[PDB]
């Protein structure tokens, strides 16, 4: 069966649920102000109560000072001493990804239209090769539209699935956990959709140059 | 005068490990919450008896890593968490290695300095064990310029000023009249530790400033 149809890039061994905050919308040429990652091995994914997070999870959450003000705030990030999106941050990201079993796939809500192009732009500014260049990515809006076979905001999906209000809405810290919960609704089905739709992060076009 | 100046970042730290010290344990999970001094200082003043549990600051950096040990956990060491050696290996975790030190260093370098680790029983357990893990590596210590303090002594001082078990949960329940969430896990307890340290953040910061010592002076748990 499936003689001509195969996964594009094999089974993904790590899913990295990703959310970010930024100074504004694309035409403003925005900068990332917060980045939150939750890295889960596929085995941790191999009304309904809200699933508890897997016991083995790697997490990274960083606040990042932008060069220009938001439409978080630049001034408050600066009085908390936050540093820019820089080479040391790339070292950190590279070392964090290196601890994950490969292939690794980012999962971000609206990542295809926002988070992934923005991250591509931020990483392009740095001297060192992008640490995401061997990683894959998918957009969880597409995933949940496929699985629910309607708003596709993160909070609306969570309430539609779990019939209770989400926690800490519209913050990267809270929303990345909400994203994980939504992806644990049908975890085997989610993994299969991710395997089938993962694409190389290197093919993501920068938001701006 | 202050031994090492005013601390600009507090890094609340907890870890899971394979057993008690005589078992020559290894770290299986490391959880850090880095908070700038100003973020702690801006915490809403505790008022009322009990005061509300403080909300975590809006700006916190977080790192949480699971680590495969070389040896199995002791009986009952992974009960509450489920972080056995077999499970960490099933989920692809790597050992405590040079790349992990590089990761920790880059995380620390994003924090304003001077930076001070804060861990409950850190002087007798977390800090010596981390020193041992780092001593095996080929990198410099990533904690070479970082300070540390134990929050048991800190909260003993702060509760005596406002006035008895000093386990993390006992302190938190005494302060907030609520049971801590996800008790007796590094992931849960590091947040409980932050909440206790937000009770009286000005007095806590003053105590930390006066008692901070270099992590490099911490003696290894074992060699």
UniProtKB/Swiss-Prot annotation, chain A:
The modification Phosphoserine is found at residue 71. Disruption phenotype: Mutant animals exhibit a dramatically reduced survival after weaning, with 50% of survival at 9 weeks or 17 weeks. In 6-8 week old animals, multiple organs show extensive inflammation. The most severe diffuse lymphocytic infiltration occurs in the heart, followed by the lung, the liver, the smooth muscle of the uterus and the salivary gland with periductal infiltration. Other tissues exhibit only minimal to mild lymphocytic infiltration. The heart phenotype includes inflammatory myocarditis leading to progressive, often dilated, cardiomyopathy and circulatory failure. Widely expressed with high expression levels detected in spleen, thymus and uterus. One of its GO terms (molecular function) is adenyl deoxyribonucleotide binding. Ubiquitinated, but not targeted to proteasomal degradation. Ubiquitination may be important for interaction with UBQLN1. The keyword Endoplasmic reticulum applies. GO terms for cellular component: cytoplasm; cytosol; endoplasmic reticulum; nuclear replication fork; nucleus; oligosaccharyltransferase complex; protein-DNA complex. This is Three-prime repair exonuclease 1. It comes from Mus musculus (Mouse). The chain holds residues 1 to 234 of 314 of the full protein.
UniProtKB/Swiss-Prot annotation, chain B:
This is Three-prime repair exonuclease 1. Optimum pH is 7.5-8.0. Homodimer. Interacts (via proline-rich region) with TCERG1/CA150 (via the second WW domain). Component of the SET complex, composed of at least ANP32A, APEX1, HMGB2, NME1, SET and TREX1. Within this complex, directly interacts with SET; this interaction does not result in TREX1 inhibition. Also interacts with NME1, but only following translocation to the nucleus. Directly interacts with UBQLN1 (via ubiquitin-like domain); the interaction may control TREX1 subcellular location. Widely expressed with high expression levels detected in spleen, thymus and uterus. Keywords: Cytoplasm, Endoplasmic reticulum, Exonuclease, Hydrolase, Magnesium, Membrane, Metal-binding, Nuclease, Nucleus, Phosphoprotein, Ubl conjugation. It is a peripheral membrane protein. GO terms for cellular component: cytoplasm; cytosol; endoplasmic reticulum; nuclear replication fork; nucleus; oligosaccharyltransferase complex; protein-DNA complex. Its EC number is 3.1.11.2. It is an enzyme of class 3 (hydrolase). Major cellular 3'-to-5' DNA exonuclease which digests single-stranded DNA (ssDNA) and double-stranded DNA (dsDNA) with mismatched 3' termini. Prevents cell-intrinsic initiation of autoimmunity. Acts by metabolizing DNA fragments from endogenous retroelements, including L1, LTR and SINE elements. Plays a key role in degradation of DNA fragments at cytosolic micronuclei arising from genome instability: its association with the endoplasmic reticulum membrane directs TREX1 to ruptured micronuclei, leading to micronuclear DNA degradation. Its cofactor is Mg(2+). Binds 2 Mg(2+) per subunit. The second magnesium ion interacts with only one residue. Substitution with Mn(2+) results in partial activity. Ubiquitinated, but not targeted to proteasomal degradation. Ubiquitination may be important for interaction with UBQLN1. Induction: Induced by cytosolic DNA. Induced by inflammatory stimuli in a cell-specific fashion. Up-regulated by IFN-alpha and IFN-gamma in B-cells and by LPS and viral and bacterial DNA (via Toll-like receptor signaling) in dendritic cells and macrophages. Changing residue 190 to D: Reduces activity. Loss of endogenous retroelement metabolization. Belongs to the exonuclease superfamily. TREX family. Substrate binds at residues 16-17, 125, 189. The chain holds residues 5 to 234 of 314 of the full protein. The modification Phosphoserine is found at residues 74, 163. One of its GO terms (biological process) is activation of immune response. Mg(2+) 2 binds at residue 14. The active site is at 184 (proton donor/acceptor). It catalyses: Exonucleolytic cleavage in the 3'- to 5'-direction to yield nucleoside 5'-phosphates.
């Amino acid at each position: 069966s499936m003689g001509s149809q195969t996964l594009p890039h094999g089974h993904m061994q790590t899913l990295i649920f990703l959310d970010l905050e930024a100074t504004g919308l694309p035409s403003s040429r925005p900068e990332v102000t917060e980045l939150c990652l939750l890295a889960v091995h596929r085995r941790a994914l191999e009304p309904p109560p809200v699933p508890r997070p897997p016991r083995v999870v790697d997490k990274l959450s960083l606040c990042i000072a932008p060069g220009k003000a938001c439409s978080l705030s630049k001034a408050e990030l600066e009085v908390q001493g936050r540093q820019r999106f820089d080479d040391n941050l790339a070292i950190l990201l590279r070392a964090f990804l290196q601890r994950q079993p490969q292939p690794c796939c980012l999962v971000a809500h609206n990542g295809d239209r926002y988070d992934f192009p923005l991250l591509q732009t931020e990483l392009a500014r740095l001297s060192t090769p992008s640490p995401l260049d061997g990683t894959f990515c998918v957009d969880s809006i597409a995933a949940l539209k496929a699985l629910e076979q309607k708003s596709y905001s993160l909070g609306s999906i969570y309430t539609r699935l779990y019939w209770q209000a989400p926690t800490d809405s519209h913050t990267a810290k809270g929303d990345v956990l909400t994203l994980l919960s939504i992806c644990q609704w049908k975890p085997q089905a989610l993994l299969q959709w991710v395997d089938e739709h993962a694409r190389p992060f290197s093919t993501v076009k920068p938001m701006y140059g």
